[PDB]
């Protein structure tokens, strides 16, 4: 769960603060995002995206309901949902979900 959380989708690790995030991850590829968890918040789920080098921040945002609207008019309740929907039409996050390169072995002796 949150904190160790399950190998899910191609951008599900684990929690990732945004610092880190822009900071760490020196962003050099064709385009992979990230989704990230609680930050400043006792269970918060955010969206990062990596560019050529920049680093975007667009929370996962909810509805007057409980569903994860980034937008508005693409709400919907499961992460995946989101990046489906932000697969070809990224009405909410501004870059479009390209690949999320696996971190499995990034470093670890």
Same mark, same amino acid.
């Given at each position: 769960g949150s904190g160790n959380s399950l190998?899910?989708?191609s951008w599900y690790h684990g929690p990732v603060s945004r610092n880190a995030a822009e900071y760490l991850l020196s962003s050099g590829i064709n385009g992979s995002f990230l989704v990230r968890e609680s930050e400043s918040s006792p269970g918060?789920?955010?969206?990062?995206?990596r560019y $050529?080098?920049?680093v975007y921040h667009y929370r996962i945002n909810t509805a007057s309901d409980g569903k994860l609207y980034v937008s508005s008019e693409s709400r919907f309740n499961t992460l995946? $949902?989101?990046?489906h929907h932000h697969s070809t039409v990224a009405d909410g996050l501004i870059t479009t979900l390209?690949?999320?390169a696996p971190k499995r072995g990034i470093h670890r002796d």
């Open positions: 190998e899910k989708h918060q789920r955010s969206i990062s995206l $050529e080098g920049r995946a $949902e989101l990046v390209h690949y999320p």
